[PDB]
Amino acid sequence: PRILVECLLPNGMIVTLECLREATLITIKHELFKEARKYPLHQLLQDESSYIFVSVTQEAEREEFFDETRRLCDLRLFQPFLKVIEPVGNREEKILNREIGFAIGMPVCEFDMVKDPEVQDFRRNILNVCKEAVDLRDLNSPHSRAMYVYPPNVESSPELPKHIYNKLDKGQIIVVIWVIVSPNNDKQKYTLKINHDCVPEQVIAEAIRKKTRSMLLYQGKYILKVCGCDEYFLEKYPLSQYKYIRSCIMLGRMPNLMLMAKESLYSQLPMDCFTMPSYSRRSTKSLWVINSALRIKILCATYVNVNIRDIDKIYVRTGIYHGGEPLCDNVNTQRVPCSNPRWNEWLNYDIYIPDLPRAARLCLSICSVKGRKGAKEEHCPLAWGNINLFDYTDTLVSGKMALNLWPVPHGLEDLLNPIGVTGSNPNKETPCLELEFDWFSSVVKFPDMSVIEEHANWSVRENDKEQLKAISTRDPLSEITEQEKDFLWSHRHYCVTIPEILPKLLLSVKWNSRDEVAQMYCLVKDWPPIKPEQAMELLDCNYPDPMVRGFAVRCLEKYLTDDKLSQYLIQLVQVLKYEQYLDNLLVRFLLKKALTNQRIGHFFFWHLKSEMHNKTVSQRFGLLLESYCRACGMYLKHLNRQVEAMEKLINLTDILKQEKKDETQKVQMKFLVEQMRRPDFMDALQGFLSPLNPAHQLGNLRLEECRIMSSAKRPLWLNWENPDIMSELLFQNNEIIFKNGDDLRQDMLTLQIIRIMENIWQNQGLDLRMLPYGCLSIGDCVGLIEVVRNSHTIMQIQCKNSHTLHQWLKDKNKGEIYDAAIDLFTRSCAGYCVATFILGIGDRHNSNIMVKDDGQLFHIDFGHFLDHKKKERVPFVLTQDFLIVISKGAQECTKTREFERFQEMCYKAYLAIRQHANLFINLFSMMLGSGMPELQSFDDIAYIRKTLALDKTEQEALEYFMKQMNDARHGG
């Protein structure tokens, strides 16, 4: 339909243009000049090709469409107007910037308006990382590009676990090699029985001999692909090492692999080229020499949102922190009435100036005073804000400053918030605060590393060994007494032989001293490297020193492999928020990983893009996103489609949220169908990769299968036909639930932890079957969750006494499948009871638990991963139905040997979790500033130490868990 576009000719006369809502830009331009031919002063106008369009978007920014074939709806222009001017920029540059801006969600020009020098230095200097990654991508093309786009999905363990080794017959796996090399697709099948240790080239050669229906002896001209998805075997690894082959071995499934030609894949992959963007072009005294105390002038607060009558007086809390350690006591200003927040006071601190560590962070807060409730006046922060006392170039901050104050985080009653972000609130309607810092007649900066080396060497048995070994094995959250700290500091030169002691010895040092920290720096310089599961802790709130995190990052560089990196990626993305500057070593590590492995890049992008809606890290993650999109290669277009699809979905649910809140199920369904039938919706929602898994493509939607649930949430079911020709081998339909209104980062954390529990149980020698199904959060209360096939809730199974579930399992597994079904049910139940107890998940009714037809059992929804209640708390008590299924329907469920082996597996699982509890502690401690209500305030993380009984010995924990189980079911 016509929208009466107002066109702005170079002369200036407005043109009333009528065009269809779906119209190409060039057609509108041609029609505009055709109409201007009727308009006066047409002779002044130049040729059509020379000019170009300009419009203002709803994002309050202007864009000049250099080469746009998009529709009017795709232009998303704020007002129906179209300026015509002579273009001046570059076509490729502007189109790339538009693409990056649509991927991030905010225009790239806003990052240019930001005049903060650290932002510009970051943007100019991270391009070295981008370019080096791109150059690495092109070292051995098209092989290197093939590795980039399709990376090997391999385990880090080449040596097979003994249980799945026994699952294989003599270590021989039978694989169905499908070859479609023919004038028409006919699906030639060759059955192979080969050892699991054979490299892909041996599979290729032996399958070639099989296809020769004799033994011919092609050579270097063939590769393998997983049937039903875009997974490929290009790297010389044991065939078992790939996750598809291990999954087939463990689940007893038949592995199907297509044999394909290298040239088809090589043609499928376009070239990746990176070009420098436009922004690629644009007295000091040592801190130790200054002899004075820290002293900062609090000038005034512009305004605070506190009642004059309700609240009598306000003051400002301050501090000098280093991580979470106050380097000295807090100072206050004298209380003033709320009307006139003027202090103008030189607050002074016990900390000596050279005694300042490189990571000091002078936290603030505007706080209230109220004596009506009691003599001890209650103090609550009206607002807060942090300042790094050093600049990105090592210089101590001087002069005046103005800080906007963030609101207090919900549920945080501590006056200061030294966990929060170190910068001003971008909003300028917030309360501000003027400060001013000491001037030393010169710019003063932290000493270089060589001076710290020079300071040392001048500033500085069996029972000891046993105590050191006992300390090293202790929990990271284990309380350390001062005697232990003095012992740790005394024998540091012997603590270096025990490299597991670095996270402990670090908390032994007083960062106040200038003498101790030089010695600690030398120690970290010569510290032997440690395992990446322990060097990850050194990247958290409590270890903010540059040398500490440099050591941790170089250890991950030497030892972290891409299998685990994809697993601990959420934690590292969240630990980015704990870094002090913009351009650090962790961000370069993560970027160089995401720019050499599209598996890492896809989820890196989606995690950051999810965390773009928080204003505290929106700027950091936006700069990171724009750098990635500069050098992400050809995947960006795909990402856009995903984003486009997601946007449409969110929009639909938005119309469901308010317009369709009060209408019934049938009318909401018919309106949903009407919204689906729109051709733009079909174009956006089909033909793109998946956010949950890049390897699985989504195809044409199935409008009949897509439907809106009748549950209270009302999410959406979306079904996609698989584009791959081998749709039957893997799965016909990809089904996903889109939820708009539920936080799904807690669910991601729970499912991840379930995955590591399953991995350690399998590695030990225990086969407890878990379902860590895919989950993704891409925004605020926006998420995608996978669908599990042939699964029904306990309520659904029971509806369709105590024997109903076992009767259903018998009907679905009558025959020889009975015993294997019962065994899988027992092992799945053991694993999930252990996991839900240890993590203390919420109340699990029937709807929370589902059972497949195979026999597996699993839990679907989460949200209390540390018992968000006040504070033990066995949520999942074994229902009598569960016991009946465990012991094969015997009435005396407790008095069976099946129940004895069930309990023994539970005990072994509990111990298995307890030896690795350090990993769970670290992974939970990396999620403190995430904003999840459940995982702030270490009082929450101490739940995972209460349910794992870390202070006691394994025998006390054994007795505690036995008592917990005995109470739970209580005979059913």
Partner: protein, 243 residues
């Protein structure tokens, strides 16, 4: 002096209530509690110095207590009093933490009103978030109006310019073209720019009103919060009696 009656001894394995009690308290405040390692005989001591809760372990051997071997004190109370009189050298011990129907009804009422204030605080927080989102979208719309006004402004400037000159009198080609179409075209142009500037102005006024509402919501939330913390503390300290 016997233990189990001293002020500093609190008892069980709470472990974190010590952090709450010692936080935001004067330097030298201390606590002694037996937990976190073994059933009895641990007796750790939390001393607040430099804003930090230092932990000191009380070793027990041969019926004697003491911070480090050799142990010269008899009971916990003797050690506590001896280090209250004399410094640890690093600060001597300064500040020790210390009908049925009526108290039961008071506790029940406090729980009920705590629930009331918690729900009120949640409603205030959700209103705060909604108003913040409205403020951000209104600021974006104001910036969009600013850009549109600017672009229409140089469009209008270019129009008048060319028009005024190219078409001035009968001597030019425009004998009556100006009156015929072009003055009306410029009239529509100025009407459009006036409409857009009026929309920008009224939306700035709406944004100012929304900002005032935001300020009021923040004031109400910030006044109601500390009362909520005080009521939570009172409810906790009556529940600690549980008798």
């Amino acid at each position: 002096m016997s233990l189990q009656d001293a002020e500093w001894y609190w008892g069980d394995i709470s472990r974190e209530e010590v952090n709450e009690k010692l936080r935001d308290t004067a330097d030298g405040t201390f606590l002694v509690r037996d937990a976190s390692t073994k059933m009895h005989g641990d007796y750790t001591l939390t001393l607040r110095k430099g804003g930090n809760n230092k932990l000191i372990k009380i070793f027990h051997r041969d019926g004697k207590y003491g911070f480090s071997d050799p142990l010269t004190f008899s009971s916990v109370v003797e050690l506590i009093n001896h280090y209250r009189n004399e410094s640890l050298a690093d600060v001597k011990l300064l500040y020790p933490v210390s009908n049925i129907e009526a108290v039961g009804k008071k506790l029940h009422e406090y729980n009920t009103q705590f629930q009331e204030k918690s729900r009120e605080y949640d409603r205030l927080y959700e209103e705060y978030t909604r108003t913040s989102q409205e403020i951000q979208m209104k600021r974006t719309a104001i910036e969009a109006f600013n850009e549109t006004i600017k672009i229409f402004e140089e469009q209008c400037q270019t129009q008048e310019r060319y028009s005024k000159e190219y078409i001035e009198k009968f001597k030019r080609e425009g004998n009556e073209k100006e009156i015929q179409r072009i003055m009306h075209n410029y009239d529509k142009l100025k009407s459009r720019i006036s409409e857009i500037i009026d929309s920008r102005r009224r939306l700035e006024e709406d944004l100012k009103k929304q900002a005032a509402e935001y300020r009021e919501i923040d004031k109400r939330m910030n006044s109601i919060k500390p009362d909520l913390i005080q009521l939570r503390k009172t409810r906790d300290q009556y529940l600690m009696w549980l008798t």
